[PDB]
Amino acid sequence: GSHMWIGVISLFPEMFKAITEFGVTGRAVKHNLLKVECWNPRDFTFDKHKTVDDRPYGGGPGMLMMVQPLRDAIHTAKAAAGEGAKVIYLSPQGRKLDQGGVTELAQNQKLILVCGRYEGIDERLIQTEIDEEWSIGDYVLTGGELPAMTLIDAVARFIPGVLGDSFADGLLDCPHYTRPEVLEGLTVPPVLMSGHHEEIRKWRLKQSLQRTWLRRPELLEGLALTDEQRKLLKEAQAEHNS
Amino acid sequence: GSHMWIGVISLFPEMFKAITEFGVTGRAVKHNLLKVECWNPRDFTFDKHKTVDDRPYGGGPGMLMMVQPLRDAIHTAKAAAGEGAKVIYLSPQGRKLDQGGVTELAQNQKLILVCGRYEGIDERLIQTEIDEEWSIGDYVLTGGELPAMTLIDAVARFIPGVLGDSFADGLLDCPHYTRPEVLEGLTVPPVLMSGHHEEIRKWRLKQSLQRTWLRRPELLEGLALTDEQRKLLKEAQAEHNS
Ligand SMILES: NC(=O)c1ccc(NCc2cccc(O)c2)nc1
Ligand SMILES: NC(=O)c1ccc(NCc2cccc(O)c2)nc1
């Protein structure tokens, strides 16, 4: 349908089994809603020791991805993708990922995700081969693989058929409760047992607004609250001030 | 040494092979710098079909983690951990992870990471079993496993012996270059070929400052720049204004 093809360039393709073999994403792959195809720069080496790293000009303690095997792997993935694939490099220097950015990236039918290791890749490859540079958050990991998997999982959720959000309207989720009715002395809010669908809807919305206000008030300033939301937030804030 | 033990509660323990079997984190596990131990709530079920999800009070289209198997798995992990383990729940409602938060979490010798699936876990379990709620970014994934792996990888980097940052001083990284000297017409900055260590250090620092200013200027307002940094940033900005 709105099938997504994702090409991955990675020195550790087997890490991606974590998303292709399990859960909701594993089902998406099995049902051909999502295709994940990996190229390993190690396969594009020609020396005896299959060297995939190289020394940075100017010195320093770190290494970089070696250009030739990585470049060749990228070119091979682009040829497989055909026309219209967006090439993305995951790094801490990239555009910060959030749900709006996920929905933007999900519009692409084809993506190629380049996973850097060591201290990343040559700046000129970013200039010549990469379309967009993205970050999954302001922290440093040992490789771009977990960020690529994170991105794949987040965009997969927008593929029709993959799933069987309060974040959609920009708020944190309300609390949820399941059995038992009492758990270490803590009871389920009676409204959720009432069967009153409208009261339940409004309770949940009010809780989301109150939680967003208390935990992440900057998220609220980015929203144009509806009439109903302005009301429930005012109520939640008044109850908080007792 | 500063060994880290991380207990994981997950319906898909095999996803964690992505960090325990490969790369720098895989080496940390093999060398006993990092221990990752998983408990699967499915193993704590008692019904024939090993049910691990349950219906939310109040209705709605989603499911929650079933309380009893998850609670029992958590209790088992806590007993294994002994004293002083911090229990962390990964969710979009949690404290946003950044490098400072990683360095804080890395101070813990023991962590227990609870991975939610479906629409997450019962709010009362958060109250009774969870010490801290963390998010790896403002986006929604199909489970807490990739966020837990992300957290594990980020904190592992602070374990002595695991690695063989410009982010440390709060800036984006400078560009890096490796062979060849010319790549699709693009040359390496001559300073990096000069062998002049101090000029190279200052170039890199100036590039980091310029890149942080252009891409993420809000990161700069959070810093108390050194004298040297104030100077190189002014220079970079003047060159940008030509
Ligand atoms: N925040 C992220 O999206 C993210 C991405 C990659 C990564 N590590 C690989 C890498 C890649 C580039 C430069 C570099 O120094 C290290 N760590 C975190
Ligand atoms: N941003 C994160 O750290 C993150 C964490 C978990 C997650 N999904 C599992 C889950 C857990 C809780 C509620 C819920 O609705 C879904 N997705 C993203």
Q: Do A57 and B177 make contact, defined as CB atoms within 8 angstroms?
A: yes
Same domain, yes or no: B125 and B115: yes
**CA–CA separation, A102 vs A133, rounded Å?**
13
Question: Does A165 qualify as catalytic in the annotation?
Answer: yes
A41 in ligand 1 pocket by Cβ < 6 Å? no
Tokens at A172, concatenated: 């944190």
Same domain, yes or no: A141 and A192: no
Domain end call among B135, B166, B197: B166
Is residue B19 within 8 A of residue B149, CB to CB? The reply is: yes
Beta bridge partners of B164: none
Residue among A64, A140, A162, A176 nearest B126 (CA): A176
Same domain, yes or no: B201 and B158: no
H/E element holding A96?
strand A86-96
Q: Do B183 and A59 make contact, defined as CB atoms within 8 angstroms?
A: no
* Angle at alpha carbon of residue A122, lines to A118 and A128, rounded to 5°: 140
* Partner residue facing B140 (CB), from A58, A157, A178: A157
Buried/exposed A178-212: b ≥16 CB within 10 Å, e otherwise: bbeeebeeeebeeebeeeeeeebebbbbbbbbbbb
Task: Look at residue A59 and give its three-state secondary structure.
Answer: coil
Same domain, yes or no: A45 and A109: yes
Buried/exposed A215-228: b ≥16 CB within 10 Å, e otherwise: ebeeebeeeebeee
Evaluate the omega torsion of the peptide bond into residue B160 and state whether it is cis, within 30 degrees of 0.
Answer: no
Is residue B151 within 8 A of residue B88, CB to CB? The reply is: yes
What CATH number does residue B104 fall under?
A: 3.40.1280.10
Same domain, yes or no: B110 and B173: no
Distance from residue A125's CA to the centre of ligand 1 (Å):
15
Same domain, yes or no: A7 and A116: yes
Provide, as residue numbers in chain A, all residues whose Cβ is less than 8 Å from the Cβ of B59.
Answer: 197, 200
Provide, as residue numbers in chain A, all residues whose Cβ is less than 8 Å from the Cβ of B23.
Answer: 12, 15, 117, 142-143, 145
Number of Cβ atoms within 10 Å of the Cβ of A159: 17
Is residue A147 within 8 A of residue A135, CB to CB? The reply is: yes
Tokens at A90, concatenated: 């995951």
User: Do the annotations mark residue A89 as ligand-binding?
Assistant: yes
Task: Look at residue A200 and give its three-state secondary structure.
Answer: helix
Which of B27, B139, B149 to mutate: most A Cβ within 10 Å? B139
Q: In which residue are the tokens 């922290």 written?
A: A139
Quote the minimal CA–CA distance from B100 to chain A in Å: 8
User: Do the annotations mark residue A141 as ligand-binding?
Assistant: yes
Residue among B228, B18, B57, B76 nearest A189 (CA): B57
Region label for A73, one of left (φ > 0), alpha (ψ between -120 and 50) or beta (otherwise): alpha
Domain end call among B115, B133, B166: B166
Same domain, yes or no: B159 and B183: no
Q: How far is CA B54 from the centre of its chain?
A: 29
H/E element holding A212?
helix A197-215
Provide, as residue numbers in chain A, all residues whose Cβ is less than 8 Å from the Cβ of B188.
Answer: 57
Same domain, yes or no: B173 and B142: no
**CA–CA separation, A166 vs A216, rounded Å?**
14
Protein residue with least CA distance to atom 15, ligand 1:
A119
Same domain, yes or no: B210 and B96: no
**CA–CA separation, B28 vs A133, rounded Å?**
29
Region label for B120, one of left (φ > 0), alpha (ψ between -120 and 50) or beta (otherwise): left
User: Do the annotations mark residue B138 as ligand-binding?
Assistant: yes
Give one DSSP letter per residue of A113-148, joined into a string. Answer: EEE--TT---HHHHHHH-SEEEESSSS--S-SHHHH
User: Do the annotations mark residue B89 as ligand-binding?
Assistant: yes
Q: In which residue are the tokens 């033990």 written?
A: B5
Same domain, yes or no: B158 and B236: no
* Partner residue facing B140 (CB), from A99, A149, A188: A99
Residues of B annotated as catalytic are: 165
Same domain, yes or no: A171 and A156: no
Tokens at B28, concatenated: 């940390």
Buried/exposed B185-220: b ≥16 CB within 10 Å, e otherwise: eeebeeebeeeeeeebebbbbbbbbbbbbeebeeeb
* Method of elucidation: X-ray
What CATH number does residue B179 fall under?
A: 1.10.1270.20
Protein residue with least CA distance to atom 5, ligand 1:
A91
- DSSP E strand stretches across B10-154: 34-39, 53-54, 64-65, 86-96, 110-115, 132-135
Number of Cβ atoms within 10 Å of the Cβ of B242: 4
Q: What is the resolution of this structure in A?
A: 1.9
Which of B178, B204, B206, B214 to mutate: most A Cβ within 10 Å? B178
Domain end call among A166, A185, A206: A166
Domain range for residue B171? 167-242
Tokens at B24, concatenated: 């720098």
Phi first, then psi: give them for residue B86, nearest 5 degrees.
-90, 130
**CA–CA separation, B60 vs B118, rounded Å?**
12
Residue among B63, B36, B4, B30 nearest B148 (CA): B36
Same domain, yes or no: A78 and A178: no
**CA–CA separation, A171 vs A15, rounded Å?**
32
Provide, as residue numbers in chain B, all residues whose Cβ is less than 8 Å from the Cβ of A27.
Answer: none
**CA–CA separation, A171 vs A227, rounded Å?**
15
| Number of domains into which chain B is organized | 2
Tokens at A57, concatenated: 């000009």
Distance from residue A116's CA to the centre of ligand 1 (Å):
7
**CA–CA separation, B231 vs A85, rounded Å?**
42
DSSP letter for A66, please: -
